[PDB]
Structures are given as C-alpha cells and as structure tokens.
Symmetry: D2
C-alpha cells in the first residue's frame, strides 16, 4: 500500500522539537506549527535531524506526532523521521508512526555502519514490504558516512512502489543532477526534494520538486515564494528570492543544525533556546550573526 | 583500574551469527584464538562487532560469555556509546552491571556535536560512572572529529577517561593527539583505531592498536607492537609491510564485511551479517583467499 | 566585443609527425564557425599551451585570425605562473592581433589572494587587450575567491570576465553573483561543460568549451534554448549531452577529445609529452558515445 | 653516489634586492648552511622561486653556488617544467654548469597520466648522465605519482637516484618508501615536507629536502642525525621542539614566511617576485615569537 498525500511539491518544513525544563514544549510547538500552516508550507517533517530525533524518547515521539496530526488536521501531509542504522529497529519506528496515523516516513540511509549499495537497497526493500506509508529516502553523506548512488536511488524508485521520493542532501551538483535525472527516468512521478536550503534553486533547475527545509522554520513564506516563483515560470524572481535569503541560509549552518535555528527561533520569541546533549546552545557570535541577518531580512 | 590501561593489541572482535541468532560456540573459538595468540585486550560490541544490530538481551549474553571465557586474564572493554548523551549513560551503566572492565564510547555520530558538546558528553558520562572510559574518534563514520586540543582537555579534566582510540588516519592528527593528550596527563593512553596506522602511531609515542586485523592474524599484530616496544623499529616496520596486503584487503568493503568473510574462509564462523550489512562480494572473497594464503593463514 | 555570450570553443592544437598540423587545424576552425560558435580560445589547456613553442604559437594564432576573418573573437591563452613572463606573452598576443587573452591564475606557486589581484593588476595596467581571468584550482593548486574575483571586477576595467572551472556550485553561484554586483557587465563563462546549464541558471553568460570541439551545434543550442527562455529544452540538451561530456574526461583533457577528433577524421591522434594517446578503453567508450551521439 | 645524500638537503631561497639577485646575501646563506652540517643544497626549487628566476639568473645563481660549495656537498638544481622537451633542455643546462644532480618536478597543470609520467622521466633519464630526483607534490601540481609508478621508475631508470615525496599522506609516504626500495634497494626517498621527516625516517627513508633548514639548519640536521644514530627518542624530541617553527613557515604559501623569517634574522631583504608578495603583519609577528622561542632571534 501507499499514502499519495505524501507526494507534495514545494516546501516541507523540518520542524524543530521545542524543549522546556527538559521536557517537550508543546505549547511553543503548536505556535510553530500554526506559523508554518499560515505561511503556505506544503508538508511538515517531524523528528528529522532538525527535530533532534536522536534525543527524543519513544513516549515523546508519540506525543509529538499525535499533537502534530491534531493541529494539522489533514491540511498537509505529516511525514515522520523514523530511521536508524538497524533495519530491524527502523521497521519498528516506521510501524509506530503508521499506527499513529502519519502520512509518511523520512528514512535516513543507515549512519555510522556504512552499508554497501546493495545493503541500502535491501534496507529500504525490507521496510517497503512491511508498511503502507509513503517512504522518503534521506541521503546526507556529510552526517552518515554513506552516499546513495543515483543509480541505487533509481533502482529503489523502480522497484519499491512505496518509496515516493528522496530528500537529497548531498550538496554536490553532479549528484543532484543525476539523482533527479535517473530516478525520474525510472519512475516519472518519483519526487526529489532538496535537503539543502541553499541548493533548492538549482535542484528546481535540475527538474526537482522542492525542499525539505530548515530555513522555513523562521522564514516559511519566503522559502514558499522561492519555490512558487520557480513553478510559475518566473525564474528571475525565484533567483532574487534565493539571493535575498542567502545570508540567512548560511547563518543557520555556522554551527551544526539545529543549534543556530533554535537560537533564531528563540530570538523571534517562539521557543526556549534549549537543546539536548550532545547539542548545546549557540555561541554568542552565532546569536549576534542571526540577530543581524534576521533584522536585515525583516524577521526581527 | 590500571587493568584497562593495556599496551599492545586489543582485538575489536566480531559478533558471529548463525541462522539469525548469536553463534556463541563460534564466538568462543574466536575468543580462545585471541587468548592463545597473546592479545592484550578484547573490545566487544565495537563497530567490528556490529553493535548497531545486536539487541540488549544479546549484548548481555555476549558480554557474559566473554568474561566467562577470559576469566580475568585480559581486560574486556565493551562498546557502549550512542549519539544521545542520556542513552549513552544508560548503556554504560548496563555495561558496568554486566562486569565490563571498561567501555569504549564513540563520539556521537550523525548529529555532529560541537567540540564543547563532545566535551560535555564525556564529562556527563565520566562523572556518573565508575568505569574506565575510552574515547573513540572515527570521523569517517560519525561525521565529527575530536580535535587534539579537545582530547587533551578531556584527558586533563576527566580522570575517568583512560584514553582514546584514534581512528582519524591523518598523521597530523595522530601526531598531535598523542602529544597533546600525554602532555595533559602522562599516562593517558592512545591506541590506533586503524591497523595500517599502528606502526606510525607507535612512532608518534602511542600505546598500540584496537585492531580489526587481529581477528584473523592476532599473533602478527602482537609481533608488530612487541618488536616496536622492545626497541626494534625496523623489525616492526617489516611486520607492518608484510601485513599490509591483509590490512588493505580487510577494508575493500565496509568493515566487518571482509573480516567476516575471512574468518569464514578460515573455518571460524558462518559468513552472516545483519541488515543493512550483507556478505562480501565474490571479488572480495577471492582477494581474501589470495591474501590469506600469501600470509600463511590459509 | 570580446564580451561574447554562448559558446567559446577551447580548440585543440593538432599535430602531425611531431610538427604543427595547420592543415587539419583550419578544417576544425571551419567546423566551429559553421555551427554558430560565438568565440574561439586558442592555446588553452585543451590546446596544449604547455608544449607549444613561441614560433608555433605565432604561426597558430595568425592562421586562426586569417581564417576567422573577424567573424568571432579570438582569445589566446597567455598565462604562466610568472607575472613578468605572462606580460611578455600577453603583449605578443596583442601584437599578432588577438581580440583578448585568457590568463590562468599562476599555477604551482600558489599565490595569495592579494598576489592574484596584483598579478592581474600589473598585466591589466600594461595592456589594452581584454583579459579573462581563468580559475581552475584542480590544475593550478589555487582558487580565486569570489570576493577576490569581485575586487578584480570592480578595480580593473581591462578585465572583461572570468572562466570559472571550479566545479563547486557554491563557487559558481557566488562568482556570478558577486562580480556582477561589483560590475554589472562583468562576464562569467563556465570552464566545465557539465556545469554550463547550472552556470546559466546562476546568471552566467555561457561556456568556454571542450565538448564543442566535437559537437559545437549542440553546445550552442544548449545555450540558445536557455537565452530564449526555454529552460526545460536547455536542460534536455544538457542531459542528452551528458554521456559525451563525461566521456571526454575519462582521461586528462585533451587526451580523450583528440582521440575523438581522430575517430571523426579531423586530426591525427598525436599529443606531446608528458601527454600520451588515449587507452583502448577510452577509445572504445568514445566510439560508442560518439555513435549514440550521431557524430560517428 | 655523491648525489645519494642522507640527511638534510636545503631547498635554499633565492634572495632579491631592489629587483635583482642578491648574491651577496645568497652567499651568506649558503655559508650558514655549510657551517651547520647540511648534507646537500637544492637550488631553484619551489622555495627558490624557480618560476620567476630568469635563464641568465639561473646560471649566475648555480655557478656561484658551486664556487662557494666547491664540492663539499652535492648541489642539486631544480630543472623541471610541464613540457618534456623544455625539461630536457633545463636538465642539460644544469649539467653543463656542473650541477651534481637535478630535481625534476612531475609536470604541473597538464595532469599527465601515470604512463605519461613514466615516459617523461624515461625520456630524460636516457638523455643525461646526471642523477635525477623525482619531485612529487600533488598539492601544487594537480598530479600524484603512484607508489607503483615510482617503483617502476626505480626499477627501470638507473639514472633516477631517488624521490622527494611531498605528498603529506602517510599511506603514500609509507608505500613510496616500501615499493621503491623493493624495486631497487639503494633508491633514495627524501621527505618533501619538514613536518613529515620524522615519520618518513621511521618508514625507512633517507632524510628531507627542507624549507625549515633555511633558518634552522643545525636543528634539522640533528633531527635526522639523531635518528640515523639510533637515538629515536632524541630524534622524536627534536621533531616535537621544531613543531612551532615548522607550522609557522607555512601559514602563508612557501617561500613567503621563510623569506620574512630570514629577513627578521638579518640574512636577506624581504623581497619576492609577483605573483608572490611579502608576508602579512600577522605572519611576521608569529615568526618573531616562534624564532625567539626557538633561540633563532
């Protein structure tokens, strides 16, 4: 089976997970979700890297996913980060998300253990055969130590009907170009979304479908506009939007994400600037950089 | 406990599987092969032991069986780190309860902590456990590199941290990790995390290796270190050069895929792994056949 | 008007019996002019500038200029890692009647960013010929920072543009953006065939090409579709050309392209040491790709 | 055999003053090298700014070097370009001037194939009597000589005496030493990075062609000499003590920092030729501190 509502185009926000006094801060979370919804965002990715999946426990995951679904109420698909480096454990998280009523799962290539390409394929196949959710492959070699080859992504697209697309966070334009080209040749409706905000414009140019975004946490309307202008055939306006957002795109990565984005959302009054070890709050220099860029972007 | 402060070879031992379960009889044979050949420590449930796919119940069985066989002859150090500081503490406590002599704690992978984050991660754990802790740096797998200055800060401040397994292959890092850590604390241990860097890490002033190659060639890796420690640098270098083909072959695919194929060729285990890992290709198996034969191991 | 838009072909320097093959060469120039190429770059990397002596240089540049008869710009590779020698080469180009010079960042000696600025400044002030900065860190060991490129753009009016062969999309993006903010009319051409489409999307002006040696009409088309406002057709030309773009770099350029031009009957497959002719594997690949491509 | 030195070969700078060779300062430097026990001199290497020294100056610099040295140690002349034809010419010029050997860089910028590199050195080998030193420096050239390629060279071209290995990867260092000496037992492998010298010696190599020895000849000599004497701990201690200076000399592209340093020491004018320019104030201040710390100032 499969859930086609996961086949979104445009911006899917990899939303942070707000904490306060060491627990989930769902009141702040709800404000953030509504901020996304009110600003034209087309999907919500919960418990991705940006949402600190490594440090959110099982009971917290269920609470956060359920609350998200309640707020969203079917307006846009809700896609849940649910991948580890164990194929068995990954299936368990996928099934928990399915049980909760999620539309889809975002499933990272196993990190740290560096599986072969055939291993990656078998990993997704095992999951694909045991769920009715739409599955999004998540490639981010900088974090995981492994890169899904475009040919491997294409084989997945052809064989695993459950897998609806891929979040491509390898910043190499050769990879972006070939991932878009090969997967869509294998299956014409396979989606390819940028996993890098600053690659979005070029991934659209390559023939892709949008972005699963960090920037949209703080600037959803602008990221939406970037994509919307492109799809409208207004390449020049899309590029101008991309240009305008550049300072913010870079500033959100001067330290490991989500450290800067949480500092920025705290500056804007949405959340407490609290993360879980081994992550720690942004440096004073990062915070000063964000303050200036946000003010210059009219967000503060 | 100075027991964990081993010099020489600590074998990062594989976890044998058969028909989807732990193969503890094969594991016992491997452990005895290690003991018979003079290795100075065992590291259980490291990367080579497929820690990501071995469940909690299996971890208990595997660690208990190891201690039963080893019977206090050499330290048993248990891999017990995740990318969550809270969960890592839990794993370390379980390891303590099991009777581990120490823990090997990988830098959090995938979430790319800052240097202050790495420090705080080890400080949090170090202050809350009675066991010796070995920092494990392996940027190629984790996405993060512990700077030599950060390792030195850890050595100076965290008395519980007994040393570092340094698997960053850059000789500049190797040189500086050894130098800065031992300046911070004279008996801070530094072991190579790469078999083919062992010789140079020894030259840099380090203490040995936590090894993949010793799963199949324990005696030769022990000889490499022993020749060095006894003042015979050129003989150590010769041992190194003779092992180089085997050292290279064991990483032509992601470890432990080749080492399990090798141990299977040698009759020790079934060639079985857990997804997302899969058995070695025919090309890899053929290479191992040749290299193991040349080495006098087949 | 060295400010060309579209395709500027980095043409190979044909040899035969260890001497310049000026006969084969002229055919190739015509092959170029017939298919709407917008410029010619002579004695670039692809033209084996390192192994072509000064007399050959002169004979080659003059023969080129006579054939082109002013139809399109002739831009001559004239750069070494010595600022003083580079000037000598640039003045020579200027005297033979070149329209512009392609000046590679000093290779091998890894100058500082200030060093690169003073390098182009010194040359720029002692010539009245259009200058193209040429950045290709993979070969030279140095990368012109976009901010350095933009400082060149703003300060040195003689510097007309940059050939950007750093394949990193981040660099491509920033080079285009900063230099054009510094100076609206500053030109940025791709130095990698397989980056052309993206460089165009980035606001660039075309490509100084290797592939165009063998498929000039297609490269021109790739650009023309883009300039006309047909982004999708352009991307398709780009995808269709992908096999050939890759095949031409399976060994160090121009080893593959010369082999290809030989398959197509244009030149003899001869290079000068330390370059040697393509392997059999390379040749077989090229034969297949060229056929699939309709060029053989 | 005279060319087959062990220990320190100084890649000596080329001094300039008011735009011309400063042979008077150069002679002072050469004497500083000899006095401090250096085992060879490499002239017109990267450190000697070979790209910007004209043909006439090359001759004047080489001739003066041989006159001062008068056969005490091998004088090896940097004589390689990215053109095989031109390289042969420079090699012949060096040979006619009386150089004891030539240091021949892998062709830079045109990225030759492994076979091309082999044919490049074969072509030169068969056409001169001088000992040739292969110079591998991928960071500057864009090409890396494979250890297997260097071993083929060792086996085949009896005229090639050794290699200056400036690829800083310890794997490459290890395998270049290992494979070349297996091909030919007396093939020399010298480090082309000061901060790799200790490890290259441990690998079984033969010393270093050095930048640091320009300012600290005796210290670099001691590093190698302690190792060769079987004094591993002492060699390691020299290595550790030289770390600050080794790093400071490359905070900007060599020879920018080493010229600033020699100028601080009063040996030369701080003048380079474009596209090189003098060291920044930050670099100058670091060198001052590091040199005083090292007892060189």
């Amino acid at each position: 089976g499969i859930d086609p509502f996961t086949m979104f185009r445009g911006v899917g926000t990899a939303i942070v997970t707000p904490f306060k006094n060491g627990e989930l801060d769902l009141e702040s979370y709800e404000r953030l979700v509504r901020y996304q919804l009110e600003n034209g965002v087309n999907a919500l990715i919960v418990l991705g890297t940006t949402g600190e999946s490594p440090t959110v426990n099982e009971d917290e995951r269920e609470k956060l996913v359920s609350r998200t679904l309640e707020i969203v109420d079917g307006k846009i698909p809700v896609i849940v980060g649910a991948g580890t480096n164990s194929t068995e454990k990954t299936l368990k998280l996928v099934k928990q998300a399915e049980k909760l009523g999620a539309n889809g799962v975002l499933v990272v290539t196993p990190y740290y253990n560096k599986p072969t390409q055939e291993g990656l394929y078998q990993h997704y196949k095992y999951i694909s055969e045991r769920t009715d959710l739409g599955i999004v492959v998540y490639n981010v070699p900088g974090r995981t130590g492994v890169n899904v080859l475009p040919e491997t992504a294409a084989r997945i697209a052809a064989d695993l009907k459950n897998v609806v697309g891929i979040k491509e966070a390898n910043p190499d334009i050769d990879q972006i170009d070939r991932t878009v080209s090969l997967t869509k040749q294998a299956r014409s409706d396979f989606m390819v979304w940028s996993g890098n905000d600053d690659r979005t414009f070029y991934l659209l140019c390559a023939g892709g479908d949008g972005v699963i975004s960090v920037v949209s946490n703080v600037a959803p309307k602008q990221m939406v506009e970037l994509c919307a202008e492109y799809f409208s055939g207004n390449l020049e306006k899309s590029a101008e939007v991309h240009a305008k957002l550049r300072p913010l795109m870079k500033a959100l990565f001067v330290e490991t994400n989500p450290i800067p984005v949480k500092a920025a959302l705290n500056l804007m009054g949405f959340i407490e600037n609290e993360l879980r070890l081994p992550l720690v709050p942004a440096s004073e220099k990062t915070v000063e950089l964000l303050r200036n860029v946000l003010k210059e972007s009219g967000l503060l």
